[PDB]
């Protein structure tokens, strides 16, 4: 399928054990993609001091589209040194591993894969 619904436990970044996914933009999209299929990725809303707190590169889920079965259309736009590689709507948050922090929240989203 070219898309797949999820629902993403949102964590506080404060919890996150684990604050990125590598080391280069093409790695960091690469886990995100595996840890989504696997159900081991969770998200972290992005409010002021959020992202100094997580590691770099950086994925965000972003809106592709103005929401199936309640599922908001999201793809992964990478950040590195202020650059983005991708091009899409809003971000949703951005993606770290989840190793069993609590979360506060669920996000549905459909990721296009």
């Known amino acids: 399928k070219t898309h797949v619904q999820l629902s993403l436990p949102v964590l506080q970044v404060r919890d996150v054990l684990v604050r990125g996914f590598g080391d280069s933009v093409e790695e960091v999209l690469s886990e995100a993609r595996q840890h989504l299929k696997d159900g081991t ?37 990478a950040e590195l040194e202020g650059i983005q590689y991708g091009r899409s709507g809003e971000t949703l948050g951005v993606l770290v591993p989840h190793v069993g922090e609590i979360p506060v929240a669920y996000r549905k989203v459909l990721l296009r894969k």
Do not use: N, T
């Open 41 to 77: 990725c969770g998200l972290v809303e992005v409010e002021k001091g959020v992202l100094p707190q997580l590691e770099q590169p950086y994925v965000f889920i972003k809106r592709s589209d103005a929401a199936p079965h309640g599922h908001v259309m999201v793809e992964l736009v």
